[PDB]
Amino acid sequence: MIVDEFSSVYECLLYCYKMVKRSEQLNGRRVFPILSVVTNNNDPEGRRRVKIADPLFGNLIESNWIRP
């Protein structure tokens, strides 16, 4: 709701309590699109998928198959 400059600590906290849910759901997710380098394009399943080297894992590990 509208939390103004005339609010108490308990309500400030309650407002955070209810409005932090979306941020909680965002944890362990990927919010923004990424730029990546294609490292594998030979898809054994013939589904035109490619493997990438995303900067998050620093090319240390390989990623999942990514669909077109």
């Binding site: 108490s8 600590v9 308990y10 400030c12």
Partner: peptide
């Protein structure tokens, strides 16, 4: 007891207004 429980809200509330004013 309830008087002091309340006095404690008043304190905590004002302490947390102090922090609001204490920060850039």
């Amino acid at each position: 007891p309830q008087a002091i429980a309340k006095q404690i809200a008043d304190i905590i509330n004002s302490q947390w207004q102090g922090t609001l004013t204490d920060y850039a």
